[PDB]
Amino acid sequence: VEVLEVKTGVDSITEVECFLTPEMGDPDEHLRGFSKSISISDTFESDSPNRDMLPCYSVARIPLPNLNGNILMWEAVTLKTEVIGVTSLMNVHSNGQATHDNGAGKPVQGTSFHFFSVGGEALELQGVLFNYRTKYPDGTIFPKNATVQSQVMNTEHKAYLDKNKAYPVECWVPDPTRNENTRYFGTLTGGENVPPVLHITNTATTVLLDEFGVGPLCKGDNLYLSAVDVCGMFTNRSGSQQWRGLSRYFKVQLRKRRVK
Amino acid sequence: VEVLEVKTGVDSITEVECFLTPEMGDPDEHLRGFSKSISISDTFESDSPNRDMLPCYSVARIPLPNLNEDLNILMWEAVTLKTEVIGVTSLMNVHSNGQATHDNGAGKPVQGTSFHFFSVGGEALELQGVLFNYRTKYPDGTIFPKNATVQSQVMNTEHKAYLDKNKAYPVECWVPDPTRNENTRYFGTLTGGENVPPVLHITNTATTVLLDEFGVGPLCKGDNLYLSAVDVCGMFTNRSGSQQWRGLSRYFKVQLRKRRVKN
Amino acid sequence: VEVLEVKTGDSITEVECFLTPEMGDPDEHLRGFSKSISISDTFESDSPNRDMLPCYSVARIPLPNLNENILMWEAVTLKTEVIGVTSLMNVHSNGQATHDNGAGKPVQGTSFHFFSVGGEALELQGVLFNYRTKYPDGTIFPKNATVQSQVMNTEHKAYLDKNKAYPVECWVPDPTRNENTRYFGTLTGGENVPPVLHITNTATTVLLDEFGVGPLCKGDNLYLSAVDVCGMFTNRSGSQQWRGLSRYFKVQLRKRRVKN
Amino acid sequence: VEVLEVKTGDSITEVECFLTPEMGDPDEHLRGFSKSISISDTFESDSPNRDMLPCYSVARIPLPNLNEDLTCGNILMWEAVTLKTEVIGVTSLMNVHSNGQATHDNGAGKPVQGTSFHFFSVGGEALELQGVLFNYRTKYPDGTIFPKNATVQSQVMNTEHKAYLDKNKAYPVECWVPDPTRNENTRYFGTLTGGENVPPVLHITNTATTVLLDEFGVGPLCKGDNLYLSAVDVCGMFTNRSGSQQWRGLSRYFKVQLRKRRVKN
Amino acid sequence: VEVLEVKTGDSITEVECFLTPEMGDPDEHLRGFSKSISISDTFESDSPNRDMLPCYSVARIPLPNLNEDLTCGNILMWEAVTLKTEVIGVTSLMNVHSNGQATHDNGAGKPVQGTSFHFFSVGGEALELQGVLFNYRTKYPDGTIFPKNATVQSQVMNTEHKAYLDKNKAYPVECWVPDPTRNENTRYFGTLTGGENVPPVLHITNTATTVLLDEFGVGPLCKGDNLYLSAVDVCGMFTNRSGSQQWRGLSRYFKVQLRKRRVKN
């Protein structure tokens, strides 16, 4: 692609606004936004996580207004994003485990992963396994032909984030060797007791242009939005723990760009 | 609206200065600024929090000087905010029926989950409902997401409301709706965890500019300014181990100017 | 006051001093410490002893007399820092061992670090943790307290006009006043909070407002106020005392012409 | 070398690669982990096994060959100008469901946490190392390259301990640091976060660039058309059901942009 | 007294060196460590041994001699303009195998953690000190230089306690701080991080420069062509298997660029 001039005028811009729901595992009809209770296999060899226990990446493919070698493409220029429902984590009165005698429920805390991406094509994934002997369950899409090298880097594990409730968070990351046409941002905050720190504002914009002033270019007039918002773990009265996730809002401003 | 020029001169500017009190539940005549002690339900199905156990959003509707005889009109535009949590040093009272942190020690200070939030708008803050637990029974006297479903635990677009009443909208059920709020500027931080330390900064030297990327602030419909806040600072643990939310008031000073619009 | 031009040339002066902390000083050996904390069994019986209450520090500094349409001293810049930060490395003076054979628990827990520069007394607003607290003789505290005093009672207005008198826990700078003062403070709460104290002679704070005007010194007096509660010292017994440190101030002033 | 003008026009190249971590790999299933940590019975008997010691990672990357023809008083060198880098596989640390120790009764497994070292360098020659020992009486194992003729001074600064990071799986992290008195032709960056419970904080983005130019606008100059990349990404320790702890490391991605620079040699 | 123009051309020099820590060095094997910490039986009987007290480090570095010929109303002085600095040997704190106290049953040794003081200064004369005592009744030991004629006022501010950092291994860290009322000809920077579980956070890079010029564009001016470097790098405490705890320190690297400045008497 040779990138030429931006189109100007009233009809040269469009905006996408939507929310991606989290896919934490949803172990029953009452537990949307939660995983199944976490269990611990006795050995790496016996690690066989239940589908319902594995958070997955969220993805939405958004069709844009139809535009057309010498063509126009939608270019993603800005992003506003927000985690939706941060105050829900103040419910410390619902089937929780008291922190001490007579105390309030222990709040959602521990390992979090907050991730979002905007691209002109599916997010490209690289597989990395904590334990190459993990048996990923039917219904998930996971690194195939895993070897002990999969624990650090096995270049065979390439995928596209092209399906919902399918790609487990723990075995996939954005592939830094690809994703030229995507902007991605993520933070893993580890530890058993790390407190969530969640900021909300409608005053913050991320610019998606690269160092050449070029944003993601939407192939086939499709925009790809991806997210993960594992906020931590909910501890119930028994001490068992479940991942808890929240939805993510996206607002993307796009402009027409001529390319060859 | 088409937004046109700012009016200048002595008469073109006004200021709002006020404080919003916290609405933490106020369980008796001695406990203004505190919630009821927290109780925990023994199942998701049995969650039934009492009204005095639920912190609520604070809101004030501030009438501004009348601009038009009949509403090509003038509107008050909010341009700058100075804000501060009032009484941060009260959290140094570690001698008042607190739980000793160890044998012969001082009282445990207020700590744990906090929510610090403020907004300035030309209309009521627009809320989206999100529920930790869709089967929670919210109490009479509160305004809460209705017709809740399991989808209410992640995103149910039915739960739309206006922050239009004080001591009514529970903090835990509602957030600013990011799909709306074009005419409001909002800012909030949830710091979770039972041990997190409050970090509270005070200064009279800090200003927030409320102008958007087009140089336009909140425009006050009907000449009303809307101020909203939550300042849940954490939990107070008393000698028994019982925990209560503790809140503090928030100071607002907003500078406004007259702006011509075509509406 | 119409504020007119700055004088140039005899037109500048500097104030440099240390403000000592007022932590309660419970005996002849314990300057910089409070009495050990004791806890009431009810809110209604909260009756803290004077030597258990840290107070605001204040100094009124007479400047060179002006005007034998007048000149006023304008405060323009501040250098400040906490003096004696390294004294908190004394972990051998009859403290509580962190574990068997261990060093003494260092000073830690709730801190309040606060400083102000003004051309008049710092203006205060009272806020009470517990409106039924009985404040002791020889302190100046919110009077006619009601339950509304726990969140905001506008009757509680005062001037920081006396050293060792205004308890820290029942007063804050009044944000509705203090037009002629610049103040800065941080409360860090929690029994395990680590002190984080920075020292440098390279950092300057500008005291000019949005209009280029610093505090103007009424009657040619500069007002410096401070609190530096660093945390609590834990004795071998488990008893805890507030520990405070002195604050250095260097203020540069210039002569400014004003009308009345 | 006096640095002259940048060549313009085939005047720019890119290196993209990843460096695997070298944590000790104690068996055929534990690539990316160390052996479980054992504690010596006395300070003077410290004697860590090779598979218990994380080492520095290094790769030397050949660049397009310059100066094929005889030149007179001048050569071209590849100059490293920008870096994008990140840790690969940060989400793997969300596996709290295998062989772990419950945080509390009925809880999930304790995640990887505790001491971390995150380090990367880009240079026109091998990273220069200085040795500093926690304990000068530590017996370092066969197959490692460690500070030799150690004395009690080695615990603070013994200027004899000079080395080049010129071998993978060999230089123990705990023995060596970048030599701040050398490394003129390298840019290095590292953070040690100590403590038994410290939580990993790992950021990923493809939007962040580090500029490698010094205060004169000159990046690392690649001697012999070779680029040296070095890394350590000890993320923390994994705790087994038994309580035994193993270091866990992750791979590092590098993308380096280079331009041809004329120099008077 | 009057600072005039910078000399150009011969006109620039660099100082590069390390300052070793002075943590107390309680025996021939324990350079960089203090004596294990003991606690007094009463507040009034506090009496720390010399080898239990970290001290300030100082080096005076001779610069190229200036003003070899008679001058008239003016001299040249070396002016310190920039500083690169870093802690040397940060990775040594990853030794969790050397007879430390296990974090839990079968776990690795507790890393160095707890209270830290990281301090450095560059000046054209000795660092000026002010004494502040935690406890004015502490008995400071023979071989140290400590605030004398201590009173209860010494616990917050006794202006009698003025000193110069003019001797290595002598001025205990806990007794002394930079005097903010003096030090016009020094630039100093320090952070105290207090608490028994405080994790070390130590960054290393050769890409960060501190500018030493004041608001008038003048750096420290070196009296008698001597540059004073001072440091403290108490990284935390090491916990032995027994539970006993020792301060652990590390060396600090300094690189200072200086230029010749003309000054009028």
Ligand SMILES: CC(=O)N[C@H]1[C@H]([C@H](O)[C@H](O)CO)O[C@@](OC[C@H]2O[C@@H](O[C@H]3[C@H](O)[C@@H](O)[C@H](O)O[C@@H]3CO)[C@H](O)[C@@H](O)[C@H]2O)(C(=O)O)C[C@@H]1O
């Ligand atoms: C820093 C400090 O001084 N620490 C001491 C502490 C404080 O002085 C107070 O808590 C301040 O309010 O006092 C500690 O002992 C409290 C008891 O003191 C007993 O008196 C003793 C005294 O401790 C000794 O210094 C003296 O040799 O003998 C006195 C008479 O026996 C009181 O009788 C008893 O009621 C308590 O007040 C404390 O642990 O709180 C000791 C600290 O070292």
